[PDB]
Design a binder for these strands. Structure first.
Ligand SMILES: *[C@@H]1O[C@H](CO)[C@@H](O[C@@H]2O[C@H](CO)[C@@H](O[C@@H]3O[C@H](CO[C@H]4O[C@H](CO)[C@@H](O)[C@H](O)[C@@H]4O)[C@@H](O)[C@H](O[C@H]4O[C@H](CO)[C@@H](O)[C@H](O)[C@@H]4O)[C@@H]3O)[C@H](O)[C@H]2NC(C)=O)[C@H](O)[C@H]1NC(C)=O
Ligand SMILES: *[C@@H]1O[C@H](CO)[C@@H](O[C@@H]2O[C@H](CO)[C@@H](O[C@@H]3O[C@H](CO[C@H]4O[C@H](CO)[C@@H](O)[C@H](O)[C@@H]4O)[C@@H](O)[C@H](O[C@H]4O[C@H](CO)[C@@H](O)[C@H](O)[C@@H]4O)[C@@H]3O)[C@H](O)[C@H]2NC(C)=O)[C@H](O)[C@H]1NC(C)=O
Ligand SMILES: *[C@@H]1O[C@H](CO)[C@@H](O[C@@H]2O[C@H](CO)[C@@H](O[C@@H]3O[C@H](CO)[C@@H](O)[C@H](O)[C@@H]3O)[C@H](O)[C@H]2NC(C)=O)[C@H](O)[C@H]1NC(C)=O
Ligand SMILES: *[C@@H]1O[C@H](CO)[C@@H](O[C@@H]2O[C@H](CO)[C@@H](O[C@@H]3O[C@H](CO)[C@@H](O)[C@H](O)[C@@H]3O)[C@H](O)[C@H]2NC(C)=O)[C@H](O)[C@H]1NC(C)=O
Ligand SMILES: *[C@@H]1O[C@H](CO)[C@@H](O[C@@H]2O[C@H](CO)[C@@H](O)[C@H](O)[C@H]2NC(C)=O)[C@H](O)[C@H]1NC(C)=O
Ligand SMILES: *[C@@H]1O[C@H](CO)[C@@H](O[C@@H]2O[C@H](CO)[C@@H](O)[C@H](O)[C@H]2NC(C)=O)[C@H](O)[C@H]1NC(C)=O
Ligand SMILES: *[C@@H]1O[C@H](CO)[C@@H](O[C@@H]2O[C@H](CO)[C@@H](O)[C@H](O)[C@H]2NC(C)=O)[C@H](O)[C@H]1NC(C)=O
Ligand SMILES: *[C@@H]1O[C@H](CO)[C@@H](O[C@@H]2O[C@H](CO)[C@@H](O)[C@H](O)[C@H]2NC(C)=O)[C@H](O)[C@H]1NC(C)=O
Lengths: 420, 420
DNA sequence: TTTT
DNA sequence: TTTT
């Protein structure tokens, strides 16, 4: 199409939980809370949020952690900007049960518009996407839910893109699809209107000027029912990034399960698994797997991970490595539910970066809604280099262990590690 | 079509190498040499042989083993039956180099017809199929090459079907395809003539009366270029047998490699691997893998086998097991080249039996020619029960070891076992 | 935070 | 015996 001549800039924002201190410095990454506060402070025209759930104050969790203050602060800002004239629009997946939405109620009193999307009725999944669209110029995409633990107790990774109206407007197209599909008694059209169609897919990515240097970027979305003709499926983009790699593949995802799970009877989904095996066997790609282990991690994952870790022989010139990133939790932090975990989901190769909002399982790519950003930048350095440095800092941390590590030495409770 | 009302009978013939003594008795299986001698003695009209290579006397190997006597005896019989009026027709793959064909020369002097098939020119593989067709009534199909070591030094498994003109004639259709395609300067027709077409495929298998009880049988052939419209591909039949299983899958194959190997650069072929994983994960199928390890076994296989053996967790209700069957070899037998190995290739489920002539790798199903027999018999007992008993005798033998076994304790030289 |  |  036509190039976006916008001073597009990108920042990698990650929230580091308390008690997690990477000795290596130079991280120099703004926290998700700081980036969100900066976005809200500069918001004056519009704001579109797509969230899995909202749990910000201490009341929504019935806890008494001072650590929630930052999250509460965000809520305050969200309440202040509605009366100023900003069109706040929030899409939140419908809770299966009658869960009280205190934060949503407060926002509705403020003047925001909340349209709850009942994904189970239409596609049989949930709306687990996390992205922001501010003034149709800036946007945030990452692994952060509107929770206060995702700002202080969960580890994270997201990108805030500034001064990129074209890409932000492309992300809005998706938010508007969610907005229309979840008002009341609606269903997926056979053909989406020309409003929701896009011209920036994997075949023809958009030419942005990222930090001065030219780059090719595009957004991919799940599930296939909600994707217009132009939009590239998230699984297709992920597999293309995996296939195009020639030197290394670094992946940091929270859950990796080659199955369409929570879908009894058990169903096998070897889409991503085969791609990694092909990459590590047909080509001399060094593949590094960084999974996160917490109390709610399905144990059946471990076996599959071992199946991947066995492909490491000189004869096969294969270099698959798997490591588990476990965030330690002391007695006080163990009381917080769904608190201490690494929820980053991204993949960096030697020539491309993938930042997504959904874990790697069949549900997130067939039923559950998700969005991802793919950026290829020619030349050394850039966004890819920063993401690679982040991954290498995580990989060499004392918080990442091999699959044979005894579960006692790990700080938290790991279901993927065998005792002694 | 129309049922074959022939007193079809089936015998499982296996050659047990010297030094291999299964303490458990009741094997009661005629040796391949005895079955071949019986077939040749009763041959009076025709005889069609498809063989990878011919090496029967001691001269063809430049050795002095008395163990070759049986093989030599077979050669003598093969020379005697040509003058009697039997139309001997032999298809043998063209040796890459100018290897002397002493046995083929002797047979040509006897009066036989030898048409050497240059598979490399047409399909870029070899003619590694092993089957016999006697009087168009009896036939033999199995893992035995026209070698004297395949009768005394290599372990084997084949089926001799007696009084089954319809099935024998169906096997001839394949032999005639090989005969026509390898005379001189020929190529694969775009559409094979109606002579080579068959009506007994996986969709409509042939109804035979095996040992009195009704059964459904059909033959599958590789590679796809040589297969007529009716003929079912060998890979398709194998995958259908794997998919249809509900209780267990027992496989005894000489080489298992999920790759189109000897095809640099390395290519990934996860066709059978995914089928086994789906069977063991989606369904509660107990899968048992019995691979054979010898000096010429590619080491890169080991890693892949380990990748399969990792799928064994209660949570995954998966029961993949892998074992290596190694035939011991003393000092005297170590001198014989390509001698001490288990070359059986078959798979038995709770409702079907597969007996094939090719190992499990990409070449044998994409390029290399191969043939297999599939028999489903309703009710307990029968051919399936005997094959299952054979597999269970092999599995519990002292000659089958787990993949973690030290390579020193094994009698032979194993490239798939790590020292200490 | 998608898993009890 | 398909693998050097
Ligand atoms: C493309 O262009 C964008 C736009 O500028 C760049 O984004 C900037 O990136 C730099 C480097 O990542 C950011 O600078 C860093 O900010 C971190 C967080 O900012 C806050 O830091 C403290 C936290 O208490 C606050 O007091 C402060 O006011 C900020 O709000 C800092 O922590 C970093 O300092 C740390 O790291 C450096 C080494 O990097 C050390 O020397 C320091 O001592 C300290 O340890 C650093 O200042 C900058 O904030 C980003 N801009 C914006 C607007 O956020 C992209 O980086 C650029 N991309 C590429 C590839 O060049
Ligand atoms: C469908 O119908 C066919 C046609 O009959 C059956 O094929 C017969 O199968 C039986 C059982 O497998 C065969 O009988 C066995 O033969 C073995 C080999 O035969 C030779 O044995 C010695 C070897 O030196 C020779 O002297 C002899 O003359 C034969 O040439 C024997 O070794 C077996 O005996 C051993 O096992 C039994 C237990 O089974 C012990 O009791 C014995 O002591 C001994 O250890 C046995 O005699 C028979 O030969 C097959 N027929 C033909 C023509 O070959 C199929 O079995 C049948 N299928 C089903 C499912 O019923
Ligand atoms: C996205 O674009 C906007 C507008 O182009 C950028 O805002 C600009 O940011 C620069 C750097 O902070 C500002 O320069 C500063 O100006 C003040 C005087 O106002 C001066 O005292 C400082 O020393 C500095 O030179 C600039 O004024 C400001 N422009 C506007 C209109 O606000 C913004 O920085 C861009 N996004 C990112 C992430 O950089
Ligand atoms: C395939 O079919 C042929 C022909 O139907 C079978 O040959 C038959 O085998 C039986 C059993 O050995 C023979 O019976 C025997 O007859 C002799 C007299 O000739 C008798 O002394 C024995 O006690 C026994 O009853 C039968 O004669 C023979 N028929 C022919 C025409 O040869 C053959 O056995 C079948 N294949 C298999 C594997 O059984
Ligand atoms: C969250 O905290 C408690 C519930 O645990 C509640 O606090 C109330 O706060 C308001 C405003 O200050 C008071 O008028 C009420 O008396 C408080 N109730 C108590 C102390 O039981 C309330 O649900 C939440 N508080 C805030 C400030 O949002
Ligand atoms: C070939 O594989 C062997 C494993 O037997 C590698 O040997 C050692 O591998 C460990 C980790 O796998 C390293 O820490 C050692 O430094 C290796 N030792 C030596 C002498 O190399 C070997 O590195 C592999 N060859 C490669 C990767 O080129
Ligand atoms: C195989 O064995 C040897 C080669 O190692 C050869 O034996 C010859 O046998 C014929 C027939 O008995 C004799 O006339 C020759 O004199 C033998 N040659 C020798 C002993 O050097 C021959 O190549 C093969 N023998 C047979 C019987 O096939
Ligand atoms: C569940 O898995 C465990 C492995 O931790 C099995 O426990 C033992 O498994 C070994 C072989 O894997 C057997 O030899 C032992 O007899 C098992 N012990 C017990 C007490 O069962 C266990 O069998 C598995 N459960 C199944 C297969 O139902």
């Amino acid at each position: 199409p036509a190039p976006c001549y916008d001073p597009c800039e990108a920042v990698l924002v990650e929230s580091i939980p308390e008690g997690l201190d990477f000795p290596n410095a130079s991280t120099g990454n703004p926290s998700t809370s700081q980036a969100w506060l900066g976005l809200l402070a500069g918001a004056h025209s519009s704001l579109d949020i797509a969230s899995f759930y909202w749990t910000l104050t201490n009341n929504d969790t019935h806890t008494q952690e001072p650590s929630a203050q930052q999250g509460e602060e965000v809520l305050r800002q969200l309440q202040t900007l509605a009366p100023k004239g900003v069109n706040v629009r929030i899409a939140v997946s419908k809770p299966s049960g009658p869960q009280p939405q205190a934060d949503l109620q407060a926002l509705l009193q403020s003047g925001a518009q909340v349209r709850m999307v009942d994904m189970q009725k239409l596609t049989h999944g949930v709306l687990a996407t996390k992205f922001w669209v501010v003034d149709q110029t800036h946007f945030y995409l990452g692994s952060a839910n509107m929770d206060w633990r995702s700002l202080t107790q969960v580890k994270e990774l997201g990108v805030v893109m500034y001064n990129c109206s074209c890409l932000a407007r492309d992300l809005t197209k998706i938010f508007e699809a969610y907005w229309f599909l979840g008002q009341a008694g609606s269903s997926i059209p056979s053909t989406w209107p020309r409003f929701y169609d896009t011209r920036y897919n994997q075949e023809t990515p958009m030419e942005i000027c990222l930090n001065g240097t030219p780059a090719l970027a595009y957004l991919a979305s799940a599930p296939p029912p909600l994707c217009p003709s132009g939009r590239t499926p998230d699984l297709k983009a992920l597999l293309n990034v995996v296939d195009n790699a020639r030197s290394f593949i670094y992946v940091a995802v929270m859950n990796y399960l080659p199955t369409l799970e929570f879908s009894h009877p058990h169903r096998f989904w070897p889409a991503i698994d085969d791609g990694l095996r092909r990459a590590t066997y047909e080509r001399g790609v060094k593949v590094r797997l960084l999974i996160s282990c917490w109390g709610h991690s399905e144990p059946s994952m471990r076996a599959f991970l071992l199946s991947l870790a066995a492909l490491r022989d000189n004869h096969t010139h294969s270099d698959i490595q798997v490591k588990l990133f476990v965030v330690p939790a002391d007695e006080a932090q163990a009381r917080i539910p769904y608190a201490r975990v690494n929820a980053n989901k991204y993949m960096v190769t030697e020539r491309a970066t993938y930042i997504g909002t959904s874990n790697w399982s069949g549900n997130y790519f067939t039923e559950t809604a998700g969005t991802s950003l793919l950026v290829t930048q020619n030349g050394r350095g850039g966004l890819r280099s920063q993401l690679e440095a982040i991954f290498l800092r995580d990989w060499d941390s004392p918080y990442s262990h091999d699959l044979d590590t005894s579960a006692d030495s790990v700080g938290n409770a790991c279901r993927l590690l065998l005792e002694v």
